[PDB]
Each structure stands twice: as structure tokens, then as C-alpha cells.
Amino acid sequence: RRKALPPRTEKMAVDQDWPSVYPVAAPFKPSAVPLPVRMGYPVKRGVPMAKEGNLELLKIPNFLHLTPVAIKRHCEALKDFCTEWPAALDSDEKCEKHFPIEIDTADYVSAGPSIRNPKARVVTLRVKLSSLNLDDHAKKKLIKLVGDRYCKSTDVLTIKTDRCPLKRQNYDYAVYLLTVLYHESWKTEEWEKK
Amino acid sequence: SLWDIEFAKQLAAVTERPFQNGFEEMIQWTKEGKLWEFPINNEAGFDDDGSEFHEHIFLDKYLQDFPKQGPIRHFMELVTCGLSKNPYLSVKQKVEHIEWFRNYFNEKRVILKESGIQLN
Amino acid sequence: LSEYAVRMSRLSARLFGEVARPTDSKSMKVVKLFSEQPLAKRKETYDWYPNHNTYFALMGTLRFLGLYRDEHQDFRDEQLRLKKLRGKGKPRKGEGKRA
């Protein structure tokens, strides 16, 4: 016994909300899509193939679950999770005098069973030297202490740590490097007098 | 106790239902652990035995059973500088390395004494 | 090159965690043997070939259980059956050369 059921197109309402049939990423089932779309290279006397049995419409990633109405309806319920950014830091001129420490953190995503990316341990530290309590001798010693990690044009010290396995460990180690580089710059030893 | 599990399976039988939405599919797969933890972080599930940076970078506390002024220090400071910049090895895995050196040098005593330099 | 710069670099290497005392380039190799993973430990080296035996035994057991249909093995069995019916089959181990 063979049965051939007509698709939902004959039953799809003209005013029915679209996000109800495509909530998440779907494989673009032609029975649930009421739009007649012809995809494929046409024949000299023919037309592009219809949506039924069309592998071309199945190879491409469909955005039927990300229409403007669905994204507006999604973010209207997502407005409750975020917080409001303080307007006291609208310009970076105040952000440099309030939060001079910058931590560049990298994150990656890839399709597959594994998540470990060896580029995730990299944590970059950027501090402007014009915002510290360095004296003349402490600064002139810290410059030669860091070397090429500190630039003279922009006057920004950069710390590039990759030795620790974990990102939190590389962050704590970069802050530890900042603490020791600020502290040991004030200690004047006996070999400095020569 | 078996009776609490037998009572929990009756709660699971009524709470479980066929999936009606792909959102509930990913909710259930995320609570079970199939879906990734969004937003995804490349260190999810790996804590490295809860160690910190002072367990990886600073390895001088393990060189106490070695001669301080001999060439053993000149040689082992290099393996410790390597283990400090080795992010692929754990704080436990570096320990059997330094212990393998501690065992080999303390096992081969005749060559270190016939080499002319004193080592303990 | 002055003593002040040698001492500054020696203390910078101490604070950053590099080699403190001057060592030769030939001896710097042992630092590299430990700073990176060896070749025989890499996932791209020791996990190069997948376990072909797992795939083969799984698919063959599934074919014997009746879920997978291996047309290649079925063709091999068809040709082997027709060869044994023709009369040139596989001799027994221990009687090919002598018997």
C-alpha cells in the first residue's frame, strides 16, 4: 500500500507567523516551505528545477529561522539578560584615564567533536606607561628592562604570555609579570652606580 | 537506597515526553551534555588539576636534591626553563621528569665521581 | 656592550623566566626538547591512522547481524561461490605442496 500526502502548502495560512515552523536551523524540508523557489542551472529549452527533490536547495545553509520578524521576536525576549553600559565612558579619553589596563583575549569556534584550540591560551596585556607612578629612574630602567615589548611612538607596554596551559593561568601570570616589572624597577642595586 | 531511585524513575517517566520543539531538543541535550556550553570556551571541562601559574613557571623548589654549584644546576635549569614554557605538560607530568633525572643521576654515581668534578 | 647592560639583561631573563646564565647555542637545544611537545607525542603523529580494524569488524558484524549490506563483500562471496562450484577453490592448509 502506497500513500502520497500533499504538503502543508495547501494548509499554510497567509497570515501565519513564520518563526513557528522554523524555530531552529532546519534542513529545509520542501514540504513545510510554501515558497516555490527554482534553483539550478536551466536547460536551453527548460527552466531551473523545482524545490521538490532539489539537492541544490539542500546543500546551501538556509536562513528561514533568522527572518527579521523572528530575530526581532528573539531579541525582545533577550533584552532581559543584558545590562546597560555606563554612559560615563562614551569616549576613550575617559576610558584611558579610568581603566588603563587592556586584556586582549581570543576565542575560537569550530564545527567538530573537539574544543581544545592551542591558540586559546594566548592572553595579551596592553598598558599605557603614561598612566603609572613611574619616576624618571624607574621609567628609564623599566624601558631597558622590557626592551622591544614597549614602543616609543605610542608609549604602550605589551605583554605576550603563552607559557601557561590555561587562559586563567596565563592571565594571572601576565598580571604577575606586570607586578614584578613595576616593583623591580624601583630597586636600585649596586651594579647601577657604574 | 534502592527505593529512592525507584521513586525517581517514576518521576522521570512522567517528566519525560517526546520532543515537540528543536529548542527543547537542544535544552535537553545541553542539560545532558551533548550540546556545547554556549558561549563556547576552548577550556570547558579542563581544569588542569586546579593548578595555577606558580605551579608551572616556578620549578626551582624541586631542585633542592641537587648540587647547587655543580654542572647539574647548569643543566637542570635548562630543563626547568623548558618545563616552564611547556604548556602541553601538566604540573604532575613535569614532576616525574625531574624525578627521572633525580633517579638517574643518583643511580649512576661512579661516572660522576670518575669525571673529576664532585657531585651529590 | 657594558657590564650594566649584561646585568640588566641577566635580571630581565630572571624576571621573565628565560635562561639566566649565558649558555651556548648547542646547549640551548635541551631547552627546546622540553619547551615543546616531541614528535612522537603529537596528536597528528600518534593518531594518524584511524583504527581500520574497528571499522572493518563493526561493519562486518553489522552485516552478519543484518543491518548493513556490504555489496563488495557480497560480490566477493558470489564470485567465490561460483569459483568453488566451477571447481578451483581454496586448498587446505598443510596439503597444497605435499598432497
Binding site: 604577575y176 | 606558580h54 | 635580571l11
Partner: peptide, 18 residues
């Protein structure tokens, strides 16, 4: 030649690096 004394344990106890 001459070697300088580096305070490692002191800096560790100071900056929580022990």
C-alpha cells in the same frame, strides 16, 4: 664570571607567586 643574587622566594611571597 660574577653572578648576581636574585630574590625569587621573596618576590613569590610578595606577588603570590609561590
Amino acid at each position: 664570571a660574577a653572578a648576581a643574587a636574585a630574590a625569587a622566594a621573596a618576590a613569590a611571597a610578595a606577588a603570590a607567586a609561590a
